[PDB]
Coordinates of C-alpha atoms and ligand atoms in Angstrom, one line a residue:
Chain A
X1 CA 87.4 167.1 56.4
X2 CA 88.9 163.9 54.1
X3 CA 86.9 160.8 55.6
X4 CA 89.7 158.6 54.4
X5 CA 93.6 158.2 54.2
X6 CA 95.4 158.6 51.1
X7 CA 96.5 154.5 50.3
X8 CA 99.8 154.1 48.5
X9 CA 100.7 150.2 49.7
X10 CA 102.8 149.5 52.0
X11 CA 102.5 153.4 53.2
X12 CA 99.6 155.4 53.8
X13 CA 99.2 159.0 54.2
X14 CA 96.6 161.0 56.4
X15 CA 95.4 164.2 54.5
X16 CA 93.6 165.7 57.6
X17 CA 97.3 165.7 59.8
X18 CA 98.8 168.2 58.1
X19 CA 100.2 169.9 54.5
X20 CA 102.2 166.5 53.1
X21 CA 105.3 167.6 51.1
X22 CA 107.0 166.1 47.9
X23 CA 110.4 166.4 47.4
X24 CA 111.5 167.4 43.8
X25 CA 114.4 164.3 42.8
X26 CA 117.4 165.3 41.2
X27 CA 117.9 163.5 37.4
X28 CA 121.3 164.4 36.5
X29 CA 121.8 161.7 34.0
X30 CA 125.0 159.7 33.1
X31 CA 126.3 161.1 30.2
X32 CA 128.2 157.6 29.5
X33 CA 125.5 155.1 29.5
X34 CA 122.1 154.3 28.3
X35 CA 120.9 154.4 32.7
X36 CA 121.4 152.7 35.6
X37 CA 125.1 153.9 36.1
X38 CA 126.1 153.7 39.8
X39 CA 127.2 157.7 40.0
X40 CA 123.1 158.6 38.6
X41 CA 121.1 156.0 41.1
X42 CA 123.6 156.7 43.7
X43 CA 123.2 160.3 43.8
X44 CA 119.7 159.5 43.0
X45 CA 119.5 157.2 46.4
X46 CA 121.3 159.9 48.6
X47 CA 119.2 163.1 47.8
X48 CA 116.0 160.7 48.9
X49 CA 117.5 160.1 51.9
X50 CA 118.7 163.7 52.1
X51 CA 114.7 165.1 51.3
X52 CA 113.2 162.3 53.9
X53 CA 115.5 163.3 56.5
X54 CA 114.1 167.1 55.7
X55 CA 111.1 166.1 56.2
X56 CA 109.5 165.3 53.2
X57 CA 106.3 162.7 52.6
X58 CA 107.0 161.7 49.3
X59 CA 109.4 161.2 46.8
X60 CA 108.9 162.9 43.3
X61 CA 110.9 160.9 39.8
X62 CA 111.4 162.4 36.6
X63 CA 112.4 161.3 33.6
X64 CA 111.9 164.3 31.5
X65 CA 113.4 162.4 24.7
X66 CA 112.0 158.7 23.6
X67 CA 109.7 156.3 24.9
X68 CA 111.9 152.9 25.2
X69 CA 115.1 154.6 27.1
X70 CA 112.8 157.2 29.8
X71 CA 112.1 153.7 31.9
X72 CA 115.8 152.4 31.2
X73 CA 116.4 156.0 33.2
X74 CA 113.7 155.7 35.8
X75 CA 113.0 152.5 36.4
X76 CA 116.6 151.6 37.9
X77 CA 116.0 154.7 40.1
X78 CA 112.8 153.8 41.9
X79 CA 114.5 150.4 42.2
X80 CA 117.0 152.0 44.6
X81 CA 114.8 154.8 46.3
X82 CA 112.1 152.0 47.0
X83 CA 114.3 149.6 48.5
X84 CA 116.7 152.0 50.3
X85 CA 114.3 155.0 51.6
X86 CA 111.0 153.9 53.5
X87 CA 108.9 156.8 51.7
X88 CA 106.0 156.8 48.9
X89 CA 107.3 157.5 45.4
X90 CA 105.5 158.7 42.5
X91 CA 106.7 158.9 39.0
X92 CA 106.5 162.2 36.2
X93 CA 105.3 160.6 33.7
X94 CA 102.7 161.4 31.0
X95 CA 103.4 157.8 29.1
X96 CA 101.3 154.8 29.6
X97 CA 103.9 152.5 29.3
X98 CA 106.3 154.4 31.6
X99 CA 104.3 154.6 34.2
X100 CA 103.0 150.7 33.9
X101 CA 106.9 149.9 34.6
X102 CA 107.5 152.6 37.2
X103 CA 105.1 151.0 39.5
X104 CA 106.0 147.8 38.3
X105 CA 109.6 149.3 39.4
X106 CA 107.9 150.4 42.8
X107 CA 106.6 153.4 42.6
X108 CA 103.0 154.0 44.3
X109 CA 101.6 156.8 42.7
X110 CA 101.0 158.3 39.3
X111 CA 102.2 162.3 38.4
X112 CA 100.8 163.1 35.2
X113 CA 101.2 166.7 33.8
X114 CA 98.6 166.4 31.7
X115 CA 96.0 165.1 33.0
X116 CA 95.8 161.6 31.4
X117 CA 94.9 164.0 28.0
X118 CA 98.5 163.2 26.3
X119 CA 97.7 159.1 26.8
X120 CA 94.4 158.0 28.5
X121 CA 95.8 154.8 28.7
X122 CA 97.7 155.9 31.4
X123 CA 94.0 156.3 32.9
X124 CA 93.3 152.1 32.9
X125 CA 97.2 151.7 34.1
X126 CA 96.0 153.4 36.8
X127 CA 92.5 151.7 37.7
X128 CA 94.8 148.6 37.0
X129 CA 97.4 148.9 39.8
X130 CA 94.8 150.8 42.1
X131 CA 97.2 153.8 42.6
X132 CA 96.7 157.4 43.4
X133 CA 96.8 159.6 40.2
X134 CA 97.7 163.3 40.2
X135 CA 95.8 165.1 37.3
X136 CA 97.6 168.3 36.5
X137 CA 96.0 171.2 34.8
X138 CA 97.8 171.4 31.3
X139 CA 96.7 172.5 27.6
X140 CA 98.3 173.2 24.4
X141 CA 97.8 176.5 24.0
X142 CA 97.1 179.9 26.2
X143 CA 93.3 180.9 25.0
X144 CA 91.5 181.6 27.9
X145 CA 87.6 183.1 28.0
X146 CA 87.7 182.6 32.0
X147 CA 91.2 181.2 33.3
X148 CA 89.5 179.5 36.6
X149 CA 86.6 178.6 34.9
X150 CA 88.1 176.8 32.1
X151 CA 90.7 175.2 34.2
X152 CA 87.9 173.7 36.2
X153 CA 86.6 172.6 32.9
X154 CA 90.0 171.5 32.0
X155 CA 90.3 169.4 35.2
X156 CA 87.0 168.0 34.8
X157 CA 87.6 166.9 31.3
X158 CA 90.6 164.8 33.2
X159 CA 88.6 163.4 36.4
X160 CA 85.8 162.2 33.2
X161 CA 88.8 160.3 31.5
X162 CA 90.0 158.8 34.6
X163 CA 86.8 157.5 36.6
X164 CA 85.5 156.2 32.8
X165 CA 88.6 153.8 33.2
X166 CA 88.1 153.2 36.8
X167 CA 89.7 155.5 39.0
X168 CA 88.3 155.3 42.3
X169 CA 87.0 159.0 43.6
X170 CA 89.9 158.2 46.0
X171 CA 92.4 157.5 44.3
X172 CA 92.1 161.2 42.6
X173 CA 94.5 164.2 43.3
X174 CA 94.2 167.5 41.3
X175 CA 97.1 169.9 40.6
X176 CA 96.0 173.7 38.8
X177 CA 99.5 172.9 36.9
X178 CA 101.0 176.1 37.9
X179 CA 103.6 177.5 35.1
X180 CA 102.0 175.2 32.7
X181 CA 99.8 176.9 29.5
X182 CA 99.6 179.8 31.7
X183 CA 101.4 183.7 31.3
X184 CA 103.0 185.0 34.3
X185 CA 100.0 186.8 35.4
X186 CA 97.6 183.9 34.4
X187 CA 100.0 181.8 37.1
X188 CA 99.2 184.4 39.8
X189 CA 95.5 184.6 38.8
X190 CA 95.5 180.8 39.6
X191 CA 97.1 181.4 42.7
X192 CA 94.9 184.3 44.1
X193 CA 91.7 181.8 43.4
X194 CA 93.4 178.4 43.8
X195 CA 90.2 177.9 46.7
X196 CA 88.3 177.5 44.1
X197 CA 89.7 173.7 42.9
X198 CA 88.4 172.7 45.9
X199 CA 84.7 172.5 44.6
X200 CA 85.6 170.0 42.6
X201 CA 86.2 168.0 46.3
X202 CA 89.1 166.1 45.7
X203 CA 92.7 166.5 47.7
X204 CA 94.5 169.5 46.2
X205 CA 98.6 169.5 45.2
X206 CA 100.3 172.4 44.2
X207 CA 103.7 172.6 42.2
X208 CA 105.3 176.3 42.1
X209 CA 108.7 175.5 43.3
X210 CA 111.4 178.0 42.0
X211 CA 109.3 178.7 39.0
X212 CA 109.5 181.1 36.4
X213 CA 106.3 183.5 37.2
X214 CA 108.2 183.9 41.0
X215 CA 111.0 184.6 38.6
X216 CA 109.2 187.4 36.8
X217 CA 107.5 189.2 40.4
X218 CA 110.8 189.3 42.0
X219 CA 113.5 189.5 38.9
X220 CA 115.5 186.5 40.6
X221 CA 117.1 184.0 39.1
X222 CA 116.1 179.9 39.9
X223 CA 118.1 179.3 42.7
X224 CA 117.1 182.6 44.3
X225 CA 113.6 181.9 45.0
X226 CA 113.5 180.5 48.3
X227 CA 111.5 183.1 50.0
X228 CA 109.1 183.7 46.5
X229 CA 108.2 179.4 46.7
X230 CA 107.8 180.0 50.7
X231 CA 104.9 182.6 49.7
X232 CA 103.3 180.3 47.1
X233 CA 103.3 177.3 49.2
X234 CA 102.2 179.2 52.6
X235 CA 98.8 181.0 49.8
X236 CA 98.6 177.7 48.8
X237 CA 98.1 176.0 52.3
X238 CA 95.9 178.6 53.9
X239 CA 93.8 178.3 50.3
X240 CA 92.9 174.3 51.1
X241 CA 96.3 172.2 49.4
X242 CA 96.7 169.4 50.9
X243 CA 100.0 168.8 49.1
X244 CA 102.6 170.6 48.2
X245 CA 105.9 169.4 45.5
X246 CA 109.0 171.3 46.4
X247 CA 113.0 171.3 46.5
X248 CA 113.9 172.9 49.1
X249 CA 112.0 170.9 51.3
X250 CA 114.2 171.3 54.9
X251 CA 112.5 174.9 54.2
X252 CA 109.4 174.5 53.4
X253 CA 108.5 171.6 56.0
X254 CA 109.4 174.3 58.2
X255 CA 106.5 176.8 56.9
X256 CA 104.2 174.2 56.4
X257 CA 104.5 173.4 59.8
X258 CA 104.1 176.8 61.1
X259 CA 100.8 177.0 58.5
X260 CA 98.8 174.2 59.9
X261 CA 99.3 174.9 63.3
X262 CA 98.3 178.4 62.7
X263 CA 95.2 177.5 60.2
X264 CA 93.9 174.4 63.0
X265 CA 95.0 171.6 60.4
X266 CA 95.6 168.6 62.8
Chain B
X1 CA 90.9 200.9 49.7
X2 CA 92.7 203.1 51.6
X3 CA 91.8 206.6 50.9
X4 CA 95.3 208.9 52.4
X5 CA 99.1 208.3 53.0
X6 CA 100.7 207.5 55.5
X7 CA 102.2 211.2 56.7
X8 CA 105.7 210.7 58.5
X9 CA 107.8 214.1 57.8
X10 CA 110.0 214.5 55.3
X11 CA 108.9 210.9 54.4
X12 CA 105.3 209.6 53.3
X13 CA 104.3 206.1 53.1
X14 CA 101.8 204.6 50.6
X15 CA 99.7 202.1 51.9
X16 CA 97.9 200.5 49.0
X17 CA 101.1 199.8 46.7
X18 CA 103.2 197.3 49.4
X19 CA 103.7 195.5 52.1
X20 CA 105.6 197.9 54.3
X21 CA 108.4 196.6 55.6
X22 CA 109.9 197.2 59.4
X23 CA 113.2 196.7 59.6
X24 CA 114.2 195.8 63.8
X25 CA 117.6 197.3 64.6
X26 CA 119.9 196.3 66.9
X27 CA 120.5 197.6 70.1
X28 CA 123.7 195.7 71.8
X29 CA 124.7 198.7 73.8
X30 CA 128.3 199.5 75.1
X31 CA 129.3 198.4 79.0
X32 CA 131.3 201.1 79.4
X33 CA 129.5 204.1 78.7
X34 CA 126.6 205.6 79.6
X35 CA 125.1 205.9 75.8
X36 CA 126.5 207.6 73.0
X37 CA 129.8 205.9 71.7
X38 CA 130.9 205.0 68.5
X39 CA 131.3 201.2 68.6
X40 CA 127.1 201.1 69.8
X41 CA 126.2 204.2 67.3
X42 CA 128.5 203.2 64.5
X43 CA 127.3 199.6 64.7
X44 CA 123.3 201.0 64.7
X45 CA 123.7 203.6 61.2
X46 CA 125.7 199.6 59.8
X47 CA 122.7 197.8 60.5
X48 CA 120.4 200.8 59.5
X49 CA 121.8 201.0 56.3
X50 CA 122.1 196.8 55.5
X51 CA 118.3 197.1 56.1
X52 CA 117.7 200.2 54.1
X53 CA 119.5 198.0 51.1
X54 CA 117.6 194.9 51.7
X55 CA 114.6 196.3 51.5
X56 CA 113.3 197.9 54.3
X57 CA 110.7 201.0 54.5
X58 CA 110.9 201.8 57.6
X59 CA 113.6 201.8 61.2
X60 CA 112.5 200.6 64.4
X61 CA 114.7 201.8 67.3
X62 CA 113.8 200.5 71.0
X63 CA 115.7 201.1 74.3
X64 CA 114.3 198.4 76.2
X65 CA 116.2 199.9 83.3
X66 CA 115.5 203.6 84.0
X67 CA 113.6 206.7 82.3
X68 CA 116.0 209.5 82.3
X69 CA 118.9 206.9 80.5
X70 CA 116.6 205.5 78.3
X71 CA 116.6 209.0 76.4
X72 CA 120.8 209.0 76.6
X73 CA 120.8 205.6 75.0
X74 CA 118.2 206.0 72.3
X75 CA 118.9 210.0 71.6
X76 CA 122.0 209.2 70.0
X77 CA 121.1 206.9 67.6
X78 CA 118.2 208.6 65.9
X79 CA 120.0 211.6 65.3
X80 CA 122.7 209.1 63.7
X81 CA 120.3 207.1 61.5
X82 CA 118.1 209.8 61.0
X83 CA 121.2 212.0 59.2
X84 CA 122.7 208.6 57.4
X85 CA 119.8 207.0 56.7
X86 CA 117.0 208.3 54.2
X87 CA 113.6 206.0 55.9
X88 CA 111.4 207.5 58.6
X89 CA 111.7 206.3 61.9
X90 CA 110.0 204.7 64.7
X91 CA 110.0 205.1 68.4
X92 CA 109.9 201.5 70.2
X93 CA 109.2 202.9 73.7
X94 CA 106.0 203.2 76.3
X95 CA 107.4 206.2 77.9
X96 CA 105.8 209.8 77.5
X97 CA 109.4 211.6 78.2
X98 CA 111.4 209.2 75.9
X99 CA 108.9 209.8 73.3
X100 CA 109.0 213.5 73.0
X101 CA 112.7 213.3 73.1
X102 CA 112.8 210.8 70.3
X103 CA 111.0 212.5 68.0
X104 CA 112.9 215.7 69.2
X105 CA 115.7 214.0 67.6
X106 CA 113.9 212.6 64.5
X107 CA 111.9 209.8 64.8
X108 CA 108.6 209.9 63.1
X109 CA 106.7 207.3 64.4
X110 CA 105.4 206.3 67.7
X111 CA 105.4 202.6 68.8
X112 CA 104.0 201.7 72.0
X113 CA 103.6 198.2 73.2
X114 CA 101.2 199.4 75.9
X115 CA 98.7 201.5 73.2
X116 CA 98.7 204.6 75.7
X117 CA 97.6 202.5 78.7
X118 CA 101.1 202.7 81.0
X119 CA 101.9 206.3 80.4
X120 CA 98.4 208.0 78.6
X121 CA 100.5 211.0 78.3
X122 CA 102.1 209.9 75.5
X123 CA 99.1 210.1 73.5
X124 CA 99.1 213.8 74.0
X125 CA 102.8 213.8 73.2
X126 CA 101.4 211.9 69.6
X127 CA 98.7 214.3 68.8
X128 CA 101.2 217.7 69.6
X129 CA 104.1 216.5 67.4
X130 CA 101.2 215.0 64.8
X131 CA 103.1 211.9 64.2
X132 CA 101.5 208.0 63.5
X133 CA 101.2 205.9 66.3
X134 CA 101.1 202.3 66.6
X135 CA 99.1 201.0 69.6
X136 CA 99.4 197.4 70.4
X137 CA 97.8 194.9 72.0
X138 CA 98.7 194.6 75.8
X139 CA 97.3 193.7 78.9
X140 CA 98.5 192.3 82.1
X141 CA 97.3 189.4 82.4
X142 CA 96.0 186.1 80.3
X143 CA 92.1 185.9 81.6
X144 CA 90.5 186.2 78.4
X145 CA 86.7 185.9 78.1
X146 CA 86.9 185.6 73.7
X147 CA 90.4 186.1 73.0
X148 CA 89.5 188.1 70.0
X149 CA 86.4 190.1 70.9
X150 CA 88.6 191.2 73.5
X151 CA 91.7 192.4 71.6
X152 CA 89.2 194.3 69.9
X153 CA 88.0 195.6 73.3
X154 CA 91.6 196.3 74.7
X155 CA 92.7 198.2 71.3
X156 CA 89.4 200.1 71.3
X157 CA 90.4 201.2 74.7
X158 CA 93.6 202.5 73.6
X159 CA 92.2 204.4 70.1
X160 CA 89.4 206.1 72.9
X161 CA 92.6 207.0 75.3
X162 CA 94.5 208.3 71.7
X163 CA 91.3 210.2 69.9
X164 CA 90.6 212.0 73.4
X165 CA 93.8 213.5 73.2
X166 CA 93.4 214.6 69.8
X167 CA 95.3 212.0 67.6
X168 CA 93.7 211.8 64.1
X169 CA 92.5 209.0 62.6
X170 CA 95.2 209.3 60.3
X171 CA 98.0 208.9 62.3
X172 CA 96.6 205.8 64.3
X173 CA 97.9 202.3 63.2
X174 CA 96.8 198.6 65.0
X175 CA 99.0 195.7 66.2
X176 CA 97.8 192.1 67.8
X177 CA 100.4 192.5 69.9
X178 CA 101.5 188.5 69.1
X179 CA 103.9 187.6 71.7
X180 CA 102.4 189.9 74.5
X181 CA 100.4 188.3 77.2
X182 CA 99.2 185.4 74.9
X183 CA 100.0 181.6 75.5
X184 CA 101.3 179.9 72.7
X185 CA 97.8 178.4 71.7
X186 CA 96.4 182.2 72.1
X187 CA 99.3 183.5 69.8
X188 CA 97.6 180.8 67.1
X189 CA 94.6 181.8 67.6
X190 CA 95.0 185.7 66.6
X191 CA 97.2 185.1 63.6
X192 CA 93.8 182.3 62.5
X193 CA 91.4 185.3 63.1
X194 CA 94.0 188.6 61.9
X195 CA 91.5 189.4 59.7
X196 CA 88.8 190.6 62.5
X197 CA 90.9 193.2 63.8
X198 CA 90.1 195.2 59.8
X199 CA 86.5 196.2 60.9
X200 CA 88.0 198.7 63.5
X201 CA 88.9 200.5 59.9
X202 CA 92.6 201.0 60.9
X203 CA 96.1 199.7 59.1
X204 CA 97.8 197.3 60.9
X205 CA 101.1 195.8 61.9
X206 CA 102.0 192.6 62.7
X207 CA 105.4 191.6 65.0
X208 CA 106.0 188.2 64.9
X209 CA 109.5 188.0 64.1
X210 CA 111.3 184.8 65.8
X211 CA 109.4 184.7 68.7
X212 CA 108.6 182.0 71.0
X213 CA 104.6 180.8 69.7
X214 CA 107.2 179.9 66.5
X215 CA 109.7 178.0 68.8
X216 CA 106.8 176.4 70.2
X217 CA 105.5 175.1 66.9
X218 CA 108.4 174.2 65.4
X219 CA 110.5 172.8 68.8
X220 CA 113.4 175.6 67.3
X221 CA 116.0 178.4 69.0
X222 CA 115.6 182.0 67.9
X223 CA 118.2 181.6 65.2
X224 CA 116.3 179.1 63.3
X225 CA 113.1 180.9 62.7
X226 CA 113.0 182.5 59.3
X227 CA 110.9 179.6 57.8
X228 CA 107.9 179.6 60.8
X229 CA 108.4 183.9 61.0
X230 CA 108.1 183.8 57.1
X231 CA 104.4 181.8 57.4
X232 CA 103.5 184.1 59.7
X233 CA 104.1 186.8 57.4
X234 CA 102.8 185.5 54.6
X235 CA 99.7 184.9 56.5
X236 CA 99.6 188.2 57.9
X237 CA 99.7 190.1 54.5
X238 CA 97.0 187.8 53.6
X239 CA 94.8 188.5 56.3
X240 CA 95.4 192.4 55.4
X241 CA 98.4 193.8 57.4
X242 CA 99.6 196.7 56.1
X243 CA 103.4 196.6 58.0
X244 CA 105.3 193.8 59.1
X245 CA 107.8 194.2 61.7
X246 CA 110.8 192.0 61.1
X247 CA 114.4 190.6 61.7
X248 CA 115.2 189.1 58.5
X249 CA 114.4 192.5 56.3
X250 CA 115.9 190.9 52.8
X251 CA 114.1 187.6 53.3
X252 CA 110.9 188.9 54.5
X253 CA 111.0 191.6 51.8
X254 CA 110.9 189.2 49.4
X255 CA 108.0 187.1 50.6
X256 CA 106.1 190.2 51.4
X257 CA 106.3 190.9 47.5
X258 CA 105.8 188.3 46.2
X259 CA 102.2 187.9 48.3
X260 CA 101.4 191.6 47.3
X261 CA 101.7 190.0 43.8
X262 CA 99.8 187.1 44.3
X263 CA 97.0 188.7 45.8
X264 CA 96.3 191.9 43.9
X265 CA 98.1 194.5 46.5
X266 CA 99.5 197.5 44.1
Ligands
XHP301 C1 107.8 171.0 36.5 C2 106.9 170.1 36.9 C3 106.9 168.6 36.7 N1 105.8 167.8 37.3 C4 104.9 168.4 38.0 N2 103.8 167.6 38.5 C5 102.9 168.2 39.2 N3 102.0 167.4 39.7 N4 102.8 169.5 39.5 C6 103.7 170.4 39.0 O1 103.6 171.7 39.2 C7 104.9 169.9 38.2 N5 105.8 170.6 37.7
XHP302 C1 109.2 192.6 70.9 C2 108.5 193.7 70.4 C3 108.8 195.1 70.7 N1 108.0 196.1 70.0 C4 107.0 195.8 69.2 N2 106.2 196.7 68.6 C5 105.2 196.4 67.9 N3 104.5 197.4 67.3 N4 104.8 195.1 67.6 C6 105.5 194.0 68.1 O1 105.1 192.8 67.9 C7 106.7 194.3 69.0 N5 107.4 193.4 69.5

């Protein structure tokens, strides 16, 4: 199906193998300083090594409130993560400059939640550095004529942005931005039709872990939705995804495992 | 889509609002007697009852080496659940004489791993009492010609064998049979191609719970197989499975609910 490998740098990851998973990083920060504390990158460094020995492909930072002080807090981070755990990282971020000094940092691919809308800048970092880009589905507001449709429309609007500042076709990643701009019922519209991203022919990521819509379906609080993320990430799989961003990701290795053997992936 | 209820007794089971959830109970029986004691009865109503609580729709009791003690060891325990416990039962046995007796003591559902084929009678016993029956997939032996064209053959053989004894439509339900005189690669191969087994126009049930094809995949002991049973369930419900037969009832419930929401079911 994908006639060539996801490149990251040093790493590169097949997309025909099986479902690849990304691990959700923990970002308690240091109440005491301004970042780069030993108890936040430590902790930061151990649940990396925790979520690659689960199984996980990829490592997922956050930083997310100003501009200057978000790469003071992530850019010691991917620092540590890089050098200590032997795994791709990619780094939440909507900011041009963050992400410029992330993968300056060593991080190898881009996660931008909206799409390279917020700061098309982010769009020639980007092109610059030759990095995969995920381009989530987002939008300011909730007005939808025909949810799938304009989220395709939405999307496009991103891929337009990002190949007009030199995004390779392979270098692009889509994500339908579950739980963002999008009622609990819009969230499982999205998820009965997610096939439907895959049109648009680019590798598909999906980020439902623990969210609020499997919340609102099962009347369980965050840390109760183990077996409501398994269901979204096993719909997701058999719909096409070929990656999926998680936290519990000892558990959901294990279905994604069980999925691509069952749906012939690999 | 589906035009009736499922009819059980007392008890009547919609099939278009849920996922219906079968509970496995436990069967540890006592060394010392020949059937009937507290500790092995007491211990069946506790289990019973944690299902019934976690979710469950439906008890599955199974005996299974002799005929006239299977109905001593089985006997017992319907009559228990069936008084304590407020869900309609299920018969896990072959058998035409433990059958009758079963239901004699309150079960309300048939479920035959050989779908009429070791003891035909049974079908007759089906039809007079006028409760559902689930015929599964079995054969004795692993020389398949199209793996699923024919299952479809083997079930059809069993719904002839029931309808000629005068079991309604109504009361007849489908299983796979995953597990059951399918390899490992076989076992893959049905859950990829569930859906197929829908044109026959019957509900069916799906039995996956722990069982080896997961081991397989996975390289895992029975004990650490709710992630690879959940995909399979997931799966399942997606493929259009009406009943899942499971170990893990709270867990699986809540998958199962969550898919029902995500793709349309009730
Ligand atoms: C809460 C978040 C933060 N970043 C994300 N990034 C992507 N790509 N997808 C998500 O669903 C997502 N959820
Ligand atoms: C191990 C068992 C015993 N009885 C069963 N009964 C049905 N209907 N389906 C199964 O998969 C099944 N597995």
């Amino acid at each position: 199906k994908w006639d060539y490998d996801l490149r990251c740098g040093e790493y590169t990851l097949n997309l025909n193998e099986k479902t690849l998973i990304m691990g959700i990083l923990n970002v308690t920060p240091d109440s005491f300083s301004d970042g780069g504390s030993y108890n936040e990158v430590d902790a930061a460094v151990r649940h990396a090594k925790e979520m690659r020995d689960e199984g996980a492909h990829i490592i997922d930072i956050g930083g997310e409130v100003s501009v200057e002080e978000e790469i003071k807090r992530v850019v010691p981070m991917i620092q540590a993560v890089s050098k200590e755990v032997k795994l791709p990282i990619s780094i939440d971020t909507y900011k041009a400059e963050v992400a410029k000094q992330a993968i300056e940092a060593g991080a190898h691919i881009i996660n931008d939640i909206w799409g390279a809308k917020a700061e098309p800048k982010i769009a020639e970092v980007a092109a610059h550095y030759d990095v995969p880009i995920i381009l989530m589905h987002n939008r300011d507001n909730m007005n939808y004529r025909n949810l799938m449709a304009d989220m395709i429309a939405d999307l496009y609007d991103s891929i337009k942005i990002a190949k007009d500042a030199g995004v390779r076709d392979e270098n692009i990643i889509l994500d339908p931005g579950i739980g963002f701009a999008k009622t609990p019922e819009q969230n499982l519209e999205a998820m009965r039709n997610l096939e439907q991203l895959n049109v648009l022919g680019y590798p598909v990521l999906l980020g439902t872990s623990r969210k609020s819509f499997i919340g609102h379906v099962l009347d369980l609080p965050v840390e109760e939705r183990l077996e409501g993320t398994g269901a979204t990430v096993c719909l997701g799989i058999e719909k096409g995804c070929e990656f999926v961003r998680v936290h519990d990701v000892k558990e959901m290795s294990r279905m994604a495992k069980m999925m691509d053997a069952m749906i012939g992936k690999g």
